[PDB]
C-alpha cells in the first residue's frame, strides 16, 4: 500500500541530473505522478501517467517505470527545480525526496548571546547559540554550562536552504530559571561542523 | 486560467470543528471532482477525501471517516470541508486540489493556497520581544501561529534570518531573527525590530542596542 521513495534526501549541483526513486510495496497500476513542492506553497503537478510531462513543465523532467519502481529524472538541475517531490497514484502519498543544492562546504559563524535583563526581570533566561551561514546543514550543537554538557532543556531551529548563498543557519536556545542561571559562571555552546578542523566553542561569563 | 482559493486561517480548541471553504473558478464548477489533502508541518502529504459536485456525492479516507463531512455550493462555485471532533496532531495545512483527469488515475493540476488550521489547547497571546544584543530579536511565548518580524520597517533585508518557531512545551510558539551588520556602524546606525503577531493585534518595536 505504501510508496516508498528514495534517496530522503538528494544534494547535486546546478547542471547534473537527479534520479528520484518511488517504489511500491504492492504491484500497482502504473498512473503514478509526480509533484513539486516548495516552502509556503502547493504542491504542483509535473509528471503524470509515470511519463507525460503536464502543462509547462520543461522537457528536462521526465518519468518512467512501471508496475512497482518508478523514476522521475531531471536532466540539467537548475536552481530553481530543487524542493520537495512526491510521487501519488490514487489516494497513496510517498514520505517526499528533499531536493538542495549541494555546495562548497562552508564554517559556521558561530555567535553566543546572554539573557537580556529584561527576560531576567521577568525570571526566565535564555541563552542563544547563533550559527550563520554553512553547509551541510547536519550540524551538532551541545550548551557547556561551567563546562559540563547540557540535554534536556533546550531547542534548535534550521533556516531552509539560502537561494543566493545556498547555506543554512541554525539557531539553539537554552532556556532556565533566573535562578537556574545565576548558579553558574561561564556559559558555552560547543559547534561540530565538517568545515570546522576542531569543534568550535563560544563562552561568555556571567559579568560583564 | 484555473483558480482555487480557501478561506482563511483558523484555530481551534480539541474536541471542536472547522469548516474551510475553497472557490473555484475558472473552469466548469460541477465537471472535476474536488479532492481535500492536508499536511502536517514538517511532514508529507495525505489524502482526506473527494466530492463530485455535481452529484454531492463523497469518499472519506478510512482515517476520516466519520469526522469529516464534505459539502458543495454550485451556485457560488464553493466547496467545504468540516472536520469536527479535532485533536492536537489534525493542526496541518488543509488543501483543496482538482483533479482533471477523466481517465487513468487522480491528478491534481490545480491546488488552493491552503488553510493552516491550528488544534492546541493554549489560548492566544502576544509575544514577548527580547533583544540580542551579529544581533537580533527573541520573540519568545507567543500563540498561535504566525508572526513578521522585519527590521527598520523593512528598510534592512540584508544579512537577515528570521528562523522558523519552534513549539515550547508550554504550547506556546517562540523564534528568533538576526541580521549581521558591519561593526562600524552599531554607535550610530539604530536597529529596531519590528514584530507583529496579527492574532493578537500585538506589534512591538524593539531597539537593540549593544
Known amino acids: 500500500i505504501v510508496l516508498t521513495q528514495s534517496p530522503a534526501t538528494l544534494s547535486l549541483s546546478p547542471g547534473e541530473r537527479a534520479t528520484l526513486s518511488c517504489r511500491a510495496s504492492?504491484?500497482?497500476?502504473?498512473?503514478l505522478a509526480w509533484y513539486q513542492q516548495k516552502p509556503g506553497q502547493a504542491p504542483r503537478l509535473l509528471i503524470y501517467?509515470?511519463?507525460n510531462r503536464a502543462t509547462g513543465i520543461p522537457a528536462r523532467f521526465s518519468g518512467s517505470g512501471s508496475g512497482t519502481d518508478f523514476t522521475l529524472t531531471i536532466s540539467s538541475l537548475e536552481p530553481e527545480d530543487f524542493a520537495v517531490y512526491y510521487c501519488q497514484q490514487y489516494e497513496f502519498f510517498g514520505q517526499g525526496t528533499k531536493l538542495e543544492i549541494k555546495r562548497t562546504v562552508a564554517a559556521p559563524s558561530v555567535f553566543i548571546f546572554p539573557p537580556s535583563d529584561e527576560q531576567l526581570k521577568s525570571g526566565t533566561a535564555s541563552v542563544v547559540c547563533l550559527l550563520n551561514n554553512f553547509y551541510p546543514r547536519e550540524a551538532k550543537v551541545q550548551w557547556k554550562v561551567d563546562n559540563a554538557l547540557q540535554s534536556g532543556n533546550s531547542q534548535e531551529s534550521v533556516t531552509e536552504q539560502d537561494s543566493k548563498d545556498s547555506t543554512y543557519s541554525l539557531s539553539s536556545t537554552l532556556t532556565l530559571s533566573k535562578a537556574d542561571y545565576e548558579k553558574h559562571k561561564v556559559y558555552a555552546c560547543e559547534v561540530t561542523h565538517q568545515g570546522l578542523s576542531s569543534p568550535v566553542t563560544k563562552s561568555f561569563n556571567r559579568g560583564e | 486560467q484555473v483558480q482555487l482559493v480557501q478561506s482563511g486561517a483558523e484555530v481551534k480548541k480539541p474536541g471542536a470543528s472547522v469548516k474551510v471553504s475553497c472557490k473555484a473558478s475558472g473552469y466548469t464548477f460541477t465537471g472535476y471532482y474536488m479532492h481535500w489533502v492536508r499536511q502536517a508541518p514538517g511532514q508529507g502529504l495525505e489524502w482526506m477525501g473527494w466530492?463530485?459536485?455535481?452529484?454531492?456525492?463523497?469518499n472519506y479516507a478510512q482515517k476520516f471517516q466519520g469526522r469529516v463531512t464534505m459539502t458543495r455550493d454550485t451556485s457560488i462555485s464553493t466547496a467545504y470541508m468540516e472536520l469536527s471532533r479535532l485533536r492536537s496532531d489534525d493542526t496541518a495545512v488543509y488543501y483543496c486540489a482538482r483533479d482533471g483527469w477523466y481517465s487513468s488515475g487522480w491528478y491534481f493540476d490545480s491546488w488552493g493556497q491552503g488553510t493552516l488550521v491550528t488544534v492546541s489547547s493554549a489560548s492566544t497571546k502576544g509575544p514577548s520581544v527580547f533583544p540580542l544584543a551579529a544581533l537580533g530579536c527573541l520573540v519568545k511565548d507567543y500563540f498561535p501561529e504566525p508572526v513578521t518580524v522585519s527590521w527598520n520597517s523593512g528598510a534592512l533585508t540584508s544579512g537577515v534570518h528570521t528562523f522558523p518557531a519552534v513549539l515550547q512545551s508550554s504550547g506556546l510558539y517562540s523564534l528568533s531573527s538576526v541580521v549581521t551588520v558591519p561593526s562600524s556602524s552599531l554607535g550610530t546606525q539604530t536597529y529596531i525590530c519590528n514584530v507583529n503577531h496579527k492574532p493578537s493585534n500585538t506589534k512591538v518595536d524593539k531597539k537593540v542596542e549593544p
Open positions: 504492492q504491484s500497482v497500476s502504473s498512473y
Open positions: 466530492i463530485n459536485p455535481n452529484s454531492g456525492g463523497t
Open positions: 501517467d509515470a511519463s
